[PDB]
A paper describes a structure:
However, amongst these remodelers, the [name] chromatin remodeler appears largely sufficient to generate the well positioned +1 and −1 nucleosomes. S.c [name] is a multi-subunit complex consisting of 15 subunits that are divided into three different modules. The catalytic module with the [name] (ATPase) RecA lobes and insert, Arp5, Ies6, Ies2, Rvb1 and Rvb2, constitutes the core unit of [name] (C-module). [name] slides nucleosomes with 40 bp of flanking DNA ~100-fold slower than nucleosomes with 80 bp of flanking DNA, displaying a switch like response to flanking DNA length.
Under these conditions, we found that [name] remodeled S.c 0/80 nucleosomes 45-fold faster compared to X.l nucleosomes. With S.c 0/80 nucleosomes, we see larger differences between the structures in the apo and ADP/BeFx states. In both states, the C-module of [name] bound to S.c nucleosomes adopts a similar architecture seen with X.l 0/80 nucleosomes. Further, in the ADP/BeFx state, the RecA lobes are in a closed conformation and stably bound to ADP/BeFx whereas in the Apo state the RecA lobes are in an open conformation. In contrast, in the presence of ADP/BeFx, the density for the Arp8 module is less distinct, suggesting that the engagement of the Arp8 module with flanking DNA is more dynamic in this nucleotide bound state. In contrast, for the [name]: S.c.0/80 (ADP/BeFx) dataset, the majority of the particles do not show density for the Arp8 module (class 3) and a small minority show clear or partial density for the Arp8 module on flanking DNA (classes 2a and 2b). These data suggest that on S.c 0/80 nucleosomes as compared to X.l 0/80 nucleosomes, a greater proportion of [name] adopts a state where the Arp8 module is more dynamic. However, our structures with the S.c 0/80 nucleosomes suggested instead that a conformationally dynamic Arp8 module correlates with greater [name] activity. However, the conformational heterogeneity of the Arp8 module on S.c 0/80 nucleosomes, which are remodeled ~45-fold faster than X.l 0/80 nucleosomes provides an additional snapshot into [name]’s sliding mechanism. The activated state is represented by the structure of [name] on S.c 0/80 nucleosomes with ADP/BeFx where more DNA is unwrapped, the Arp8 module adopts additional conformational states and the RecA lobes are closed.
Numbering used by the authors:
A (entry chain E), B (entry chain A): 40 to 134
C (entry chain F), D (entry chain B): 24 to 102
E (entry chain G): 15 to 118
F (entry chain C): 66 to 119
G (entry chain H): 36 to 128
H (entry chain R): 436 to 506, 532 to 570, 584 to 588
I (entry chain S): 112 to 162
Amino acid sequence: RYKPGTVALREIRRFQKSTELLIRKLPFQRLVREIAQDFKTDLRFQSSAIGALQESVEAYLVSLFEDTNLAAIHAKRVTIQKKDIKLARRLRGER
Amino acid sequence: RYKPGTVALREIRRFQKSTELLIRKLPFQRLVREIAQDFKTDLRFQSSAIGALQESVEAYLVSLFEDTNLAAIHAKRVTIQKKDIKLARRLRGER
Amino acid sequence: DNIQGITKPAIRRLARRGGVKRISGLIYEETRGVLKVFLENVIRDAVTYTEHAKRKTVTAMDVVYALKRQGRTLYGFGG
Amino acid sequence: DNIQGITKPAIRRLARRGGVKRISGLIYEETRGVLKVFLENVIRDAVTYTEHAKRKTVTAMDVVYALKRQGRTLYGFGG
Amino acid sequence: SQSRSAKAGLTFPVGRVHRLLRRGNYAQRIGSGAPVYLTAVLEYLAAEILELAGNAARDNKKTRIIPRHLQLAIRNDDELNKLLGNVTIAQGGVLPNIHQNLLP
Amino acid sequence: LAGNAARDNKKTRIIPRHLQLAIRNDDELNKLLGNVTIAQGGVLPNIHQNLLPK
Amino acid sequence: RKETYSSYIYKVLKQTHPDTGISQKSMSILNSFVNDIFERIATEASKLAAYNKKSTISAREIQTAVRLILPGELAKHAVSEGTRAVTKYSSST
Amino acid sequence: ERVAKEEEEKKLKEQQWRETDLNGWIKDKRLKLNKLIKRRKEKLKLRDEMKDRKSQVSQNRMKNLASLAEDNDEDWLIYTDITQNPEAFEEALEYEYKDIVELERLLLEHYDWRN
Amino acid sequence: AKKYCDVTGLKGFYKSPTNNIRYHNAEIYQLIVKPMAPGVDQEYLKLRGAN
DNA sequence: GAGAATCCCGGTGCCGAGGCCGCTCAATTGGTCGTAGACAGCTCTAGCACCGCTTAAACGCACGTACGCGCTGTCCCCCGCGTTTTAACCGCCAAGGGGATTACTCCCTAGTCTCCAGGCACGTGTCAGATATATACATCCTGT
DNA sequence: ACAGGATGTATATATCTGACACGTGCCTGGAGACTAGGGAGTAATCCCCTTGGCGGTTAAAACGCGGGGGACAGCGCGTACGTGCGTTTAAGCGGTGCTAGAGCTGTCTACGACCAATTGAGCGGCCTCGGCACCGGGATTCTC
């Protein structure tokens, strides 16, 4: 049979060199549409602004995620938790 | 007599309770001159410039002590270590 | 199903692009929350920028200058 | 003897304004290094400012712009 | 005759900020409502900061305004701290905060 | 830097990924442009050692 | 003629706290704070004027910049007071 | 297993009391639900009063904070109790809502739009 | 001229001091006049030409 | 040693990358002139050096205990994979919303002269605090 | 364990300096009237792009389930740092002399805005083609 962890680093390497888009266009597009509903009504968009939004969000999530990975290994751990995320938010200074 | 940990709370309350400077002035002035003459020799300095440098390093160090103590509680400990300082410097952003 | 447009393989991919190995099984909601606050900050600034321009669609130019206001400047989509 | 011209109980006083109970013995010299690189990054900008000011005296204006520009602006001494 | 500050019901000057906007090379044309709008915003911000500073100075039972009271007013308030989360203060100190487990 | 990041990646066309590694590999351009983010270039690969097993 | 805002914030402190005095370091705090707010709002208004091919700064750009800079409750109170001041000044008849 | 046995014995005693005197048990559960609702209303009133910066509660909080910033285990506990509790209040409100739901279930076992 | 509530169209007893909106009673104020978005009072005042 | 699973290599369809052309509006050339800048000259604030002195603090060191750190068992909770459900992607024609551009009248603001008073440099007073004196009682610390 | 002589307290005074206040002379930028050029307000109008929606696919998401490497609570050696005390050092003061150069002023002038003529650099658009996107067979190299 198999062992966990080695296939985890395997598709870490598989997604590491490839630099594709990750999250699909349509559901995040709908989410952007409903999050702009409450400020102004009957707002349209364009396809370049949605892609700019996707790029900024994936950049934010990656830049938070290896930082919270570093926060996880500094407490001698591999699995991430709530308090690792709160510590990353506190140390990066959005509070 | 007191148990070890109560008078430490008393002096930490006294140090948080006041507003005086905590760095000796003449070693700081000597340090500023010896760290400035490599860039430009025979320089002259203003006293309030030395005061500005004083209050800037005081604010920077005390904020650094906040987030390195946050690194200390994050690793289920009390005493800070050097890896807590490196984690705080990395999560702040600079190298 | 409103916030549920983004899903488990998406944030699994994003955490894997963070280089993490083991995730928790209910890190879901605070990531959804910070997702929500990042978007509402960015498109609130974009809505104000397009409101002053009398442009009732949101353009790419507005959101990249919203990020450049926010200190997370983007290259390639104008500027 | 000027790099550790500022001393270790002063570092303890600054730490116990900062709210940390126990400190190590190996944190003094690295805090001295952090302090040294901080004033290096400050008076590099300050000495460029006073070099362009056609002046030999570093005033409060040059240092206050130097920490203004790095996102650490300081009030009161800018008068 | 009379100044524009009393015409708009303000105490901050209007011609002064009009001058400072003029050769501050922000733009080559400046409208008439610009200095009165800036003047009113500066009025409200200074009045709010002075309100909280006076409350902190009275809270100290001490009859002057010391920058410790300014620090207390800046960090006790929520969105004033959000507006001033970048600026370092002169002779202000640090708000008292002890983390919960350090208490035995 | 875009050119010498393009030669080793067996391509005679410059792709934003290649100059992403060019600006992530040189330190001076790294903290010259640390606050900016670029288009579909991803992240340079690195693996920390305790994540590496055995 | 070194120019500073001392008298004006002296009076608006005096209309609410009569038996209170200001220190000189604190005096400098309010002076630097007013100048910093002025600089931030004015450069955002100039940036928003250069946004729209517009060579003139008017009250609408500064209202948008105030709504951009300040947090929300401060923003709504600031635009309320500024709009009241503008309508006071404009109807000088 | 002893706590589980005690809980099962308490459930059996509650079932015997509900079968024996449903009216008195229902009245006691309704009184407990009313007390829980009054406690929840007082907690919501306190949470709304803390949100007002011009309220006297915020002035008292500022007086206590400056009293810890201008001039013992009890004062230490007071400083521990003066901390901000934004999420702790929400967790306590959720616990009180669960307790009110349990009180309503015990009452069952034993806001008007026109205005 | 008669004064009417801007939201409901009923008789307007009170006027808000922040945005000059006339409202009917307390719950109208607390649910509409206080938490309204900034830029919605202007076309509330545009119907009677008061912007 | 099996078993995928990346890397390599040859073949092929394809679409933006580069090269070319029409032509406009912007770069350049050229002379005028008010004026900001260079630049010498000069007043005097303030920065540097330093002699010596009290002492708080820095330094040094002994003792010990809360705590850093290694070991460990155990609950369990994510990992890996198969199946099933579902909606994302994609082709794509279409209605029209709404900027882009254009034309054009006009209120709006730069510019200029006169001017005066509001606001800054620098003077004169006012309690807050410190320090005493004095006559008792009160109390405390020590020796007898 | 008590008495006796030290300070401590109290409750008035008294004198006296310290660190704030307030009040005044006087200049330069604010206010007013005014012109006139032009950026902005405004209506029309071309047509680019965005929005909706068939429906068909199919890879991607959802559910579930065995299970094993890791979180996490508990434990214990010991060592590194708290705590406290004696010795040492140059931190702080403050005194003042010397003078460097920061700051201000007048004069000269050489640099850059400003208007005008004008020509090709450089942008919009069109077109051939080749490098990389795609695709499939098979080498090959981690993994259990």
